[PDB]
Structures are given as structure tokens and as C-alpha cells.
Write a protein that binds this ligand. Structure first.
Ligand SMILES: CC(=O)N[C@H]1[C@H](Oc2ccc([N+](=O)[O-])cc2)O[C@H](CO)[C@@H](O[C@@H]2O[C@@H](C)[C@@H](O)[C@@H](O)[C@@H]2O)[C@@H]1O[C@@H]1O[C@H](CO)[C@H](O)[C@H](O)[C@H]1O[C@@H]1O[C@@H](C)[C@@H](O)[C@@H](O)[C@@H]1O
Ligand SMILES: CC(=O)N[C@H]1[C@H](Oc2ccc([N+](=O)[O-])cc2)O[C@H](CO)[C@@H](O[C@@H]2O[C@@H](C)[C@@H](O)[C@@H](O)[C@@H]2O)[C@@H]1O[C@@H]1O[C@H](CO)[C@H](O)[C@H](O)[C@H]1O[C@@H]1O[C@@H](C)[C@@H](O)[C@@H](O)[C@@H]1O
Ligand code: NA
Ligand code: NA
Lengths: 311, 302
């Protein structure tokens, strides 16, 4: 319809501190730049074009995000993946089932239970561990491998990663949540991976939204999980499907108390934000978390942003 | 601002009492069922009620301080901000699962270590003297012999209440937020069956744990969480007694049934006799706002 092809672009009118991470369900706790200015990312969750096209394993909503489901035989180590709703995972079509975790460079410590409940007594929760850099980690091929033999009844199991730790191998290496796992095998490449996102350069830098995930690391600091977009942005775009009318959407991060612009950002159609750091050490991490991103105008990709923060 | 609801199939939307996909749309098994959920409560102009969060990020989490050797979790908001006593039933997003024991998993935050499993199991009964979230605290079943600090987590699975012994889980109910001395202030109000041929519509998702029926623990809620987020963002003024919705098959554009969305944040339909109701409909439909109507507008039976 005319209305559909002329639908004005909008973003959710909610403060950032109230919005959610798109790599796991949690409130956003900060904005950061990547420690390495050359950091390329290839997250498989939290990937959506601003006209509402989902990429990688990204779900439309948080209901499906960061869950794992599959069948496992008693005495086996192999979880044969399905979609979160129990339907078959069409392998080679996607890197993994929709919402499957994309936490690379760490060990996963999962909690799962047999579904649906068919019991009248007892604790149904089971602890399993998954390494992501071993030959058995092949979600693209339809399966992942637990560390230990699964001595519990054969069936359909659902759950999630509860906490993460430093990868078992190579021994001594740290968690690196900037990376995704290898979804494929030594024999087969993972098909339909969401593409990499490169630093824009020319004064601009990628903006990441972070939330702490349980577990230790070599730095005795929170495991901050960076993502490109709040989940509510993704849901909004999927619902709205507003046509992209320019190279980038200029956003102002506005203080709700004073109505003053705290920082200029560009939201690119590929589904990521940039800013111009106001010198070394400056950046969006210096801004309060109660601001609201407001859509100002479609702009050229060459449009220059006022630098944000203080060096 | 014109009123709209999210253009996303129902099966892709989320429960507003815990983060999970909606797996069904039902009427209450008891036609006289009154509900008083504290989460998933939002006026359709974007006004949150009870303990309802704007988004799923805050939903169904518990945070507080606990001392090594104590049984008491002194609650904060999920972001660590102080919780004000006597003001609300509980912190924003605090679970509202009544008539069950809670089996929680929590961890000390932020991480300040390079070693170890940080996860702790604790259990909470909701009908005991120590369950007083309105006063800012809940009591664990066992003494907490783990380091003092700021803990965050959620309910992992539920079971039949410890007392009275033998009683079953009933997720149509909420816990007792209040104390012996005072009732909880600012509870979201009860929602009563509308009568006049109409019936309340509930969105259901399964939650882990046993029960006396050896069946799934089904969690009913009044609105998908995405509807709440939408209303909070849009803040569209209510301009009729009810918003008339069509539940549309997006594959064909066929109208599968008429519903009313009331200003108080709940949906009704008219069942076409017994056996009929929204549970007969496929879950891939999208609700579409059609018109503001008066409360006397008669719905076509579903
Ligand atoms: C405190 C506890 O663990 N209670 C268990 C109970 O434990 C014992 C029974 C007898 C002895 N003994 O001879 O000395 C020692 C320990 O065992 C029964 C039977 O297995 C458990 O009840 C059953 O499982 C529950 C999950 C419910 O489905 C219940 O209906 C079943 O009968 C009992 O577990 C507790 O049951 C309570 C209701 O009666 C209530 O549901 C409570 O939350 C349950 O405790 C939880 O589950 C336990 C298995 C355990 O994990 C505990 O830490 C949890 O809090
Ligand atoms: C298999 C295991 O449990 N590995 C543990 C290791 O356990 C033992 C140490 C010594 C004995 N013994 O003398 O007989 C027996 C078992 O203990 C070390 C600490 O000394 C653990 O490493 C530390 O904790 C981890 C969570 C990491 O933070 C790590 O950096 C710390 O040094 C070790 O845990 C495993 O470490 C691996 C990296 O080296 C990897 O992170 C792996 O996932 C860890 O295993 C998990 O955590 C354990 C504590 C345990 O809960 C296990 O079930 C988990 O899979
Ligand atoms: Na692999
Ligand atoms: Na109480």
C-alpha cells in the first residue's frame, strides 16, 4: 500500500537503561567503543537491517533469544539441535537455530531440562558444559557436544547458557566476547552467516551496547557482552518495516531532563551505530545511561558528526 | 498519535510474566476466574501498573544484598538502585508466581574474580512470614553460607508449595507481597470476568518444574510484553471504551476473529458457545487495530 511504502522511520522512545541486550536477555548497562579500534565484529544475534530484515540467527523478539533446544540420547554426548519451538532445524540454511547463542572464545555452562514436564516430583534441572572450539561444536551441521556423557533420560531438552568461563583450550587464554564461535566443521563452512561489520574509519567508530554476563575471566572484571542494537530496536524494525530513505539515520542521544543533545550518532541501514570520539579516551561510555535516542533526519553517509565526550 | 499494536505474529511474541514465547491463547478454565497479576499490567496509553517493566530486560529478575550466614535477601531494583519500602508491592520486574515454591539461581555481581562457578541455588516460599517483598525483603529456605554481596538471578524452576502440604501449583494466583502488619500498597488491581457473553483472553507459556498433574506449568498473562513496550513508547491516547482488533492470518489476510482490547490492558472475545474460543485459532495470526468502539459494541463470536 501507499502508506506502507511511505511509512516514516522511527525508533523506540525509551531510555537506553531500560532497553535490552540483543545477544542475551538483559538490560543494557553501558555504551562502549571496542578496545581495539580495528575490531571487526560478526555477531549472529542482534543483527537486523533498519527496514526490518533479520540476519544471522537473530530473533524478532527476546522470547526466542539465547535458548538452546535439542534431542539427546541417554549415554550420549551429542545434542541434536532443533528450533526453540521444537520444530526441525533446517541445517545449511542458517548458521544455527534462531536465537542460538553466539558467544565465542569461552566455555559454556548450561542448564537444561526435559520438555514438556511429565513429572510430579523432583528437580528437573541438569548441568552440562560445551566447548566451542572442539570438533564436536558443529551447530551448522545440526549438533553440539557436551563435555561429559549425559546420564539422564533420552528426550527433548531445552535451556540456556547460565555462566561462561575462560576457554578450556588453548589453556590460559581469556574469554573474548568480541568473537563468535566456529559454527561449521573442518570440512564444511557455515552458510548464511550474518556478514562482518567493519570499523567505518574517517573519525567514526562503532558503538556497542554492553551487559554483564555471569562468570569469571582473566581480568577479574565483568564479562561485558557487546551488541550492535537494542533488542527493542530490532522488534520495532521488524514490526514497522519502514523503508530506508537515506544513507544513514541521524540520531540525537537526548537527556530526558533537559532536552539537550548529549551526542550525535549515525544509525546505518546495516543495523549498527557510529559516533565520532572527541579524542583519545573520549566516547559514549562517558554519557549517562538515561538518554533517549531520537531520530532527527536521514543523512548522507558523508555527513559529519559533532564529536562526543571529552578526551 | 494514532493507536496501533505490533505487527508481529502471536507465536513470535513474548509472555509478560517471564521471558518466553507465547505458546497458546486461552480462556480461564474457571469462567469466574479473577486475576491480579502484577507483571504484564499496562494501560493501553502506556501507563505501567503493579511491578510491570517496560521491557523484557527487567522482567522476572531478582536482585538484592545478602550477608554471609543470613537467610534474608534485601531487595534492590534490578539495576541496583534502592527499592523504596511501603511504596510498591515489589521491585520492578519481581516475579509474580503465586502458589508455588521458587527454586532460584543467583550469582554475586559484578564479577571480581578469575576463578570458579559463581552460581548459587536458593529456595523461596511465598506464603511464609519472611516473604515480604513490599517491605523490601524475602527469606531463603536455608542459611546462605556464601560470600556477602550483591546478588542477581531469577527463578529457574518451580514446585508445589511446601505448605499446606499436598497443595498444587496455581499460577493463576499471585504471591502475598504484604506482611502481618500491612498489606502491599499500589498493587495492580484485580481484573474481573466481563460477563455479557465476553470472556478474558490469556496468553500462556510453559515454565519448568513438576506439579500434581504431571503436566506443564502453564503461565497465563494478559498482554504480550511487546504490546507493553509498544504502548510505553507510543503513548497513544485512548479514544474509545475499547479498541476493536481483528486477529488476521498474514498469509491470506483473512480475519479469524474479533477481539476487544480494553483501556485497562486486557483482551476479551465472545466464545461461540462451549468448545469455542480463541484456543481454536492458529497462533500465527497478527492482531490489527480496526476502530475505537463503545463498550456496548457486540463482538462477533469466535
Ligand atoms: C527439603 C527437600 O529436599 N524436600 C524434598 C524431600 O526430601 C527428603 C525427604 C525425606 C528425607 N528423609 O527421609 O530423611 C530427606 C529428604 O523429598 C521429597 C520426595 O522426593 C521432595 O518432594 C518431591 O519433589 C518436589 C520437587 C515436589 O514435586 C514434591 O511434591 C515431591 O513430593 C521434597 O522436595 C520438596 O517438596 C516440597 C513439597 O512437599 C516443595 O515442593 C519443595 O520446594 C521441594 O524441595 C525442592 O525440591 C527438592 C527435590 C530439593 O531440590 C530441594 O532443595 C528443593 O527446595
Ligand atoms: C574440570 C574442572 O573442574 N576444572 C577446574 C579445576 O578443577 C580441579 C582442580 C584441582 C583438582 N584436584 O586437585 O584434584 C580437581 C579439579 O579447578 C580450577 C581451579 O583450580 C578451575 O579453573 C578455574 O575456574 C574456572 C571456572 C576458570 O575461571 C579458570 O580460569 C579458573 O582457573 C577449573 O575449571 C575449568 O577451567 C577451565 C579453564 O582452565 C574452563 O574454564 C572450564 O570451563 C572450567 O570448568 C568449569 O568450572 C569448574 C569450577 C567446574 O564447575 C566445572 O564443572 C566447569 O566445567
Ligand atoms: Na565448529
Ligand atoms: Na507476605
Amino acid at each position: 500500500t501507499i502508506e506502507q511504502k511511505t511509512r516514516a522511520f522511527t525508533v523506540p522512545n525509551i531510555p537506553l537503561q531500560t532497553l535490552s541486550n540483543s545477544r542475551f536477555p538483559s538490560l543494557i548497562q553501558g555504551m562502549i567503543l571496542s578496545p581495539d579500534a580495528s575490531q571487526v565484529v560478526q555477531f549472529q544475534n542482534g543483527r537486523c537491517l533498519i527496514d526490518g530484515q533479520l540476519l544471522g540467527t537473530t530473533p524478532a523478539t527476546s522470547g526466542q533469544l539465547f535458548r538452546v533446544r535439542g534431542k539427546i540420547n541417554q549415554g550420549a554426548r551429542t545434542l541434536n539441535l532443533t528450533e526453540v519451538d521444537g520444530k526441525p532445524f533446517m541445517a545449511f540454511d542458517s548458521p544455527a537455530p534462531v536465537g542460538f547463542p553466539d558467544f565465542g572464545k569461552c566455555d559454556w555452562h548450561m542448564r537444561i531440562s526435559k520438555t514438556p514436564n511429565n513429572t510430579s516430583s523432583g528437580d528437573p534441572m541438569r548441568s552440562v558444559s560445551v566447548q566451542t572450539n572442539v570438533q564436536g561444536f558443529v551447530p551448522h551441521l545440526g549438533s553440539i557436544q557436551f563435555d561429559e556423557v549425559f546420564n539422564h533420560p533420552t528426550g527433548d531438552y531445552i535451556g540456556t547458557i547460565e555462566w561462561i568461563s575462560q576457554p578450556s583450550t588453548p589453556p590460559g587464554t581469556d574469554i573474548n566476547l568480541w568473537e563468535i564461535p566456529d559454527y561449521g566443521s573442518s570440512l564444511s563452512q557455515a552458510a548464511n552467516l550474518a556478514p562482518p561489520v567493519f570499523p567505518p574509519g574517517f573519525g567514526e567508530a562503532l558503538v556497542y551496547f554492553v551487559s554483564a554476563f555471569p562468570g569469571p575471566n582473566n581480568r577479574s572484571a565483568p564479562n561485558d557482552v557487546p551488541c550492535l542494537l537494542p533488542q527493542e530496536y530490532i522488534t520495532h524494525f521488524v514490526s514497522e518495516q519502514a523503508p530506508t530513505m537515506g544513507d544513514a539515520a541521524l540520531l540525537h542521544y537526548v537527556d530526558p531532563d533537559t532536552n539537550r543533545n548529549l551526542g550525535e550518532f549515525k544509525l546505518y541501514p546495516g543495523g549498527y551505530l557510529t559516533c565520532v570520539p572527541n579524542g583519545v579516551g573520549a566516547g559514549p561510555q562517558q554519557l549517562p545511561l538515561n538518554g533517549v535516542f531520537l531520530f532527527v533526519s536521514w543523512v548522507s553517509r558523508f555527513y559529519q558528526l559533532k564529536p562526543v565526550g571529552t578526551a
